[PDB]
Amino acid sequence: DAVMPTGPAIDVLAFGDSLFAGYRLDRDESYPARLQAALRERGLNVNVTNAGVSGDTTAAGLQRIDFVLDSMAGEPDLVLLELGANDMLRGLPAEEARRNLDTILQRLDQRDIPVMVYGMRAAPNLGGDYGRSFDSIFPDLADKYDAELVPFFIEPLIFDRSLVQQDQLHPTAQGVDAMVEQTVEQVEDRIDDL
Amino acid sequence: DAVMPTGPAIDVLAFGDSLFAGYRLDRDESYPARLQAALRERGLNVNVTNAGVSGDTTAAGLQRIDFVLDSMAGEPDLVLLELGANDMLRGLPAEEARRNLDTILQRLDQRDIPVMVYGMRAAPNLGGDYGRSFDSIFPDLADKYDAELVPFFIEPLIFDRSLVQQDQLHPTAQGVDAMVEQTVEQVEDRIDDL
Ligand SMILES: [Ca+2]
Ligand SMILES: [Ca+2]
Ligand SMILES: [Ca+2]
Ligand SMILES: [Ca+2]
Ligand SMILES: [Ca+2]
Ligand SMILES: [Ca+2]
Ligand SMILES: [Ca+2]
């Protein structure tokens, strides 16, 4: 079933945030490494460089894109661009993300490097207006720069919670209240006893 | 129902990580702020200082405990100590978390500041051996230093997903495989077409 890779080496740069970096995974388990393996199994002589940085916003990506590109052994043949999630999770304006991704795409145009734009979706609790403004960044910019759009690539995670890390729990406001109800009697006693 | 607080202020220092800092929450929604409100409703004249820092390991906490204490207007009457989760989540050695928490409790003993130790439990991703060495840190150190143990105060979060932030999804290794299966055909086509 597997096809031996042949042909000249194809350098792919995976430029993104935690979803490329492999948050809390071994580097060889991250999306860029596993994608490399799957492409090579199909006969493509591909090397994927993992330039994912957990926590990167579109601003942080723009700040380092030229350096990351310069640091490769020649220009890459293809860039995978996956940023925006951290802007949304931090409540930064959708317009700033759009502008920073636009600039990144301008820089790749200037270097004649083709790109695939990985789309991202805003959390529902940011409201419908933010959702429409953020979610449309990716198809709009893919269209403007004649890049392919990759649909939300974490969609499998939405439909199978077993595919999502469950080790790290952050409370909502109501979760905090439950934590207080569970501890206030003990803390009250301790303070009263000082 | 509320009891008006009376008497001199009682200063409580909440020294911890994201479970005290209020990760992606407003200040008034964090555990230290909600704990303060609950205690004052019961008639205690308490001021809880939120010294939570998201991301803090036991080593990071040890590094800043003296600076944090030396920056208060007088020493606190009580410290709530809540660290270890980030050591665990990063697979850092349980023995080093134990040693750092021990040193913190030693410095608090030396300043005669009472302490409540907030226990933490290792995630299942860490395996049984790690869990047994990590989970015992908190009752062991609470007994050694004659401090109270607050058992596992995020217990309500484990059992009710509605109390836990769901906006940030990180794949397991299996989740990454699913993301590759969702995108490989499109990436293969784009590389083939270069
Ligand atoms: Ca003492
Ligand atoms: Ca002592
Ligand atoms: Ca003494
Ligand atoms: Ca084709
Ligand atoms: Ca084609
Ligand atoms: Ca195509
Ligand atoms: Ca070709």
Residue numbers in the entry:
A (entry chain B), B (entry chain A): 12 to 205
Study authors write:
Here, we reported the enzymatic characterizations and crystal structures of marine bacterial esterases CrmE10 and AlinE4. The results showed that both CrmE10 and AlinE4 belong to the SGNH-hydrolase superfamily and the bacterial lipolytic enzyme GDSL family. The SGNH-hydrolase family, a superfamily that includes the bacterial lipolytic enzyme GDSL family, consists of enzymes possessing four strictly conserved residues, Ser, Gly, Asn, and His, in four conserved blocks, I, II, III, and V, respectively. Among these four residues, Ser and His serve as catalytic residues, and Ser, Gly, and Asn serve as oxyanion hole residues.
The CrmE10 structure was composed of 12 α-helices (including three 310-helices) and 5 β-strands. The N-terminal region had a compact architecture that was mainly composed of five predominant β-strands (β1–β5) surrounded by eight α-helices (α1–α8). The C-terminal region was a long α-helix, α9 (Ala184–Asp203), that extended away from the subunit core and wrapped in the other chain. In CrmE10 and AlinE4 structures, catalytic residue Ser was located on helix α1, and residues Asp and His were located on the loop between helix η3 (CrmE10) or helix η2 (AlinE4) and helix α9, which were typically different from other esterases. Interestingly, the catalytic triads of CrmE10 and AlinE4 were not composed of Ser, Asp, and His from the same chain, which was common in other esterases. As mutants CrmE10-S29A and CrmE10-D178A had no activity, the results showed that residues Ser29 and Asp178 influenced the enzymatic activity of CrmE10 by domain swapping. Thus, dimerization participated in the active sites of CrmE10, and this mechanism might also fit AlinE4 due to the similar architecture, which was different from other homologs. CrmE10 had about 30% activity at 4 °C and showed no activity above 40 °C, which indicated that CrmE10 was a cold-active enzyme.
